[PDB]
Amino acid sequence: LDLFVSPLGRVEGDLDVRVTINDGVVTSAWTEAAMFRGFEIILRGKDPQAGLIVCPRICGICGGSHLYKSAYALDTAWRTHMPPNATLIRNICQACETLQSIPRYFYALFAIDLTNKNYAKSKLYDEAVRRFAPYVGTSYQPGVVLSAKPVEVYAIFGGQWPXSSFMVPGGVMSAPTLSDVTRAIAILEHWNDNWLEKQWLGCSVDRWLENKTWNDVLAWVDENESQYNSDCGFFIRYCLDVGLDKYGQGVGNYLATGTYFEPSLYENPTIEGRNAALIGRSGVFADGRYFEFDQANVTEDVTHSFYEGNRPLHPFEGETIPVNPEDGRRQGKYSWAKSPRYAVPGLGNVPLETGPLARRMAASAPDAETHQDDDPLFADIYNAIGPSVMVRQLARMHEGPKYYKWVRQWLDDLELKESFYTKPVEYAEGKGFGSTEAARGALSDWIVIEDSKIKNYQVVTPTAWNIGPRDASEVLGPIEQALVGSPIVDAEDPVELGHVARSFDSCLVCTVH
Amino acid sequence: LDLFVSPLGRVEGDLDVRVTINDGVVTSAWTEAAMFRGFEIILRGKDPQAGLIVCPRICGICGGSHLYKSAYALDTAWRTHMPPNATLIRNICQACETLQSIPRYFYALFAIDLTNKNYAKSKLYDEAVRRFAPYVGTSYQPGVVLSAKPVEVYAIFGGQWPXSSFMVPGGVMSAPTLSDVTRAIAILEHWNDNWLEKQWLGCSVDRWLENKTWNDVLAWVDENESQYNSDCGFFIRYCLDVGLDKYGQGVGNYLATGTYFEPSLYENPTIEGRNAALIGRSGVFADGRYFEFDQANVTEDVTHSFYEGNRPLHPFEGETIPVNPEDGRRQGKYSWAKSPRYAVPGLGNVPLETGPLARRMAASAPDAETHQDDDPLFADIYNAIGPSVMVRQLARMHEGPKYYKWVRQWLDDLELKESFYTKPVEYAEGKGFGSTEAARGALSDWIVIEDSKIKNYQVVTPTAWNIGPRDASEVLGPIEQALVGSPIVDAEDPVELGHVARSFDSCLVCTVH
Amino acid sequence: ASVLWFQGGACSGNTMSFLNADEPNVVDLIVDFGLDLLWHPSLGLELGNNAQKVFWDCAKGERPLDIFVFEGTVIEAPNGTGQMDMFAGRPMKDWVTDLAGAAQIVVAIGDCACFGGIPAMEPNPSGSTGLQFHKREKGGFLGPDFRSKMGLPVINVPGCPAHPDWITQILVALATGRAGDITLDDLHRPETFFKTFTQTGCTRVQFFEYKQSTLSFGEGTRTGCLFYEFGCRGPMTHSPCNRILWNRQSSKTRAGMPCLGCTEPEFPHFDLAPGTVFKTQKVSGMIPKEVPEGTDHLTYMGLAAAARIAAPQWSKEDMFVV
């Protein structure tokens, strides 16, 4: 059965999913990003800092992430100096946006599918409906409402969220005051207490972060009623009951560009020094092995994308030349997503899944420096049960406690008397690479400044990595492979497709930009 | 046993209570208001509108009520015109302050005493502790936190709360916009939903307002689990279990000056037309009979108060001449509270209890006009079980649903294109009477303007009515008589005294001003 | 009141801003104000054919559509086909045609929907336009004479993104019987939000008054106004951004970021051409090319010279201190 699902909403943009179904299982899948705005085209010729305005408008939910990496793209292009406070503020705001994204996505975009009638037979279904039904769910409402709190912190430093551009080469535009920081701490602490610990975890962030193995997590669920009936404990039990741990595996290979710089280690942003300075470590996990991320290995294929092109392009030489979808479909193109691929030695240019799971895998790599996220939990989970909708979601949710603690510490690290901005030299020429871990994964800008104008500007967003179509080798993108193998109980409401696409927290406006 | 309790906190100011105890029962009581600021003295000679600044500073919790009646004192003194919108805004803000006072007082000031160890034997004690323990109580925290919401509405119209003076002769200073009203509605609706209906009632305000008899209220508690386990249902059941319905009766005579004017009926405030224009009806309930309120009948006795004076003074001729408490105590004076008395025909100058219960009794008077509060509930409750800490508290809590609905309607009544202010003539001479029902009851200003200055300014606050000392006839004030008959399980923690004093929502800074 | 919220060439920033709503928050708005959110690409439960059934019922009039909210641009490329924005089996613009013609009220939320916004920046690869405007030029996709069934033009809730209140309070107004209180300016923006300027309530206006310029970002923004060196469009931008604070905390200009003038139909102003980003274009190095709304260069500069001379000492010092 060929099934074309349109729209597959709650992926922050326009997505159609075509699947071939045999015996109630997806055997092939096509993700079709359906809406193109062309920001890379628009940015050509604009002011070198136009990206700080334009790139946040790639996405409303992860615009702050776009701002972060666009700023660092300029910071690297212009060889700027970043005062530690600016790095801290950038870290805080990037993390705060993600902390907003985590519950907002989980409740408003993902968990309402847990109420699907396919699960009516589950003993947990009534509770799932009570908790996660859209708008009226008892977990939905506070989860969604409180998700605005972390971006209040963003607004304290950036003026507003979404839609600030306050991250500029050389630092940030703002100059936090004491009451800014104390309020940011208060907002974060309240949000942590009222959503993260009370509703999501039913325990302290510290207790959750003590989970180092999958068995730890299972013990955590059963440890006491609070954790058992928390949103996290319920979600795990629900997943294990309804089978969300049994599909959505995907590529099993992961890309994290990392984000969050240790302020002392990235005071002078360079492409080369980027990895060592990261707190949230970059890392490529492929064929069960850890590799260092190197932006030079990134290519974008447009073979099945609605763009002209005959070879994968590293984004520094990237091009965004749309073809009419009517013509492109005649050439087998089916998506406005480019196909980002990553050259892994011995594997060729492979699709890599990006996102929290990729980050958690990267965080389990050996040889973490002291400032760096060193977390074996998802190495263990990956080996124990492998990837799945549940594991992917747990990776996302796992970042809530981890990022909250980082933000809380970064807020304490702010030295309010110290500089937040070093006026950079706006060089007429420059090649910049900025990358961050948006909520959804590796988010990267490759910018070429020439003659005090944007010569090239190539954004590769995490969902582009995940949802980008087949490459020249016909290798399915991560979400496409994750969709393959998914059961389809009801072709009329193929919620499992939604589960898989949304387990990546897919953002289609970011996918295409 | 003579017991002197000092301080008896959570009465918004300085209160000492002396009681004589015989066989574990209070047989006589003295309320000692212990702190004097002398705002009536300060106001003498000041600008005629100084009251709008000074009187709110009589009290932080009911300053908006002080502002309301101070404004109307000027409106009457200066024969001003009140555009209906201004009347509406005044009504809204007065009611919003009360809506803030109701939960803030109930949880932060009153209900934490329900956790007293005297109740450890009650089967409901653990739940009372879970709900109402200070700061950590599961009802305390949201109750107190959400109590700030109604005064956000006040701030929308008045700029801030507390401490606005935006109610001026001729209207209000502000000019609400559309977003002001829509936000005010949204704030009110959220507060109603999240505290009043969800936490306090466990049902709709409408369902609660269907209770017309004490038996209705008892049926309401038992009707379903939501109402049974609401804060209201629990409080009633707790009161009936621990005996809060068995003492704190008090005078059984009541004074309501009323407040909330029907805008069309008080466009030209006069003393004489005040009663007819009231929505929240004035009314004196004494010896089981209803009387019309008449400010001319008010006197203040200082026989046992720390003021010079030899005869009860109507406040238009009032005086505030402090005596040194060391000297006053030698003359049997014991309180900075004056003793307001009310001339009821056939009863002489009697103490009248003010507050919600007084209002609810006044609302049960016959011959309510269409705009007027006509509610038989507390006539029935009074006849069924009589006054008590529980009934007094229920009267207070009963106003939440009633005032919410009025405010919601008043917000709808605002005609945003219409005037909010008619510039008055600031007459050099004038006698003004302004009165409102502050959260705690009849709050009244008698102002005399002479030579464009304040010649006399006499405030009589509700807790002055309630907590004012014995008059010249040695007749105990309402709180003093309410204290008489109160059991005293533990003279070391005489919480029942606290229950009684706080059941009046006593405000000692208002008492003395 | 049924609400259908569609996204064309959107980034979903207006939805994300909208979800930050407080008083009312979005849940209370969707649930407790009688606004039946039929579907929203970011929030609607229905997918695939169940979603399209909702859309087609609204488009064909099978079920009432009281408010059609459109976010993002109306993408007309390629060649007027709109296929750079294929939604639910149609070019989004065709949905827009049908649903705008079905709705009682059409709300464009965000510059993209209102005026074309960032995607309409040259070279405008997506052929993006606003619902009833292309930048300042009235017309846009629906034409200058489009009226919803309630007789209103597209209500433009501009911004990039719109502040949640700019739409929620309008929705509350519509839900509480105060639609008649909503007046729209010449750009169809609610005057209750767009008579003020961004500058209105900016914490730097005193510096603006005394012509004291913020000189640098970061700690440089502890003083001064952003108008002179950072191209703040605050004085030329109609918004309540400093009256109704963003995220109940701040605003661009308070934080030290120049107002980009995003509520104005030309946004991004000058199409982010080189030299115009976070910079004040000046004539002869001292005269701003653009002076505050309603002023002229001669009187503005004259008053500015006098203001510079009268400037008190505190206006020359840090004020947003740690």
Add this chain to the structure above:
Amino acid sequence: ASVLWFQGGACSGNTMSFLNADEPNVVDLIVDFGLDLLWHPSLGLELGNNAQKVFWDCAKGERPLDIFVFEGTVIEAPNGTGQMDMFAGRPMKDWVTDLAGAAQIVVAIGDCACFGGIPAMEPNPSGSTGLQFHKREKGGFLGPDFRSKMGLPVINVPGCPAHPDWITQILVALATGRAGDITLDDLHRPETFFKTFTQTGCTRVQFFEYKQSTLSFGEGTRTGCLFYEFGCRGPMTHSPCNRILWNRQSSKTRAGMPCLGCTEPEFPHFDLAPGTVFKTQKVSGMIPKEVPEGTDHLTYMGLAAAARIAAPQWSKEDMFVV
């Protein structure tokens, strides 16, 4: 950090304002920031001897007192005895003496505690004074040289009442290890709140700039600045009232109420003498007796004349429209 919050000649408005705290709210402050509120007359559970036991233990050093918050005036009448404020068996001023000498930090919250405030208005029947100030004159009850055990003078959180943030954020600062970030101005007010003016962020500053006066209350406040006709002390008053909005909504001046200058030690200014309430005292009918801080009448009036001439049309029209 133990906190003892006492009230002298208070109206409890600072407590009530404090209870409106958000981010943090008061419960989270009291519970989740490690601030042990030992007692508060409006909130403490203990009464009678159990309360006095807490006080005496703090006064005598039996238990540590980290923050002594005093609200309301130090009442010294009659005849310096303080018996117009008898608290827990002593004149409150004696408690103040003992507890201020015991605390690591003393915070005066509200003008009453800071400067004497309204009760200290003539004829000051209660002999009220502030902790370390009587109006502007440094000294107050504790003397100019009083220092808490952490070496600080009384921290003055002025206002009538103080905005909740003015104390909560200081409490958060003290609780989060940022006490060293707290700088105090010459009145011991936290400069993080009191370097700005009330005018800073006022929505009427543009009207102030162009010398466009609000002429009347109510709908008259849809335009104009309150400085000229309503005695707004905004430009002479250090506060963040228009930076950090009251009740997260508004401020006096935004709403159309003149700033009374309540954060300043002279409040109420002119002791509310006849003719000074909601009126601008003027010389020769046109010159304000008091000009904005740091300005002089000559340059202020000169600039004002120029501003009046340069004034754009919108500054003469309603802006806070329905």
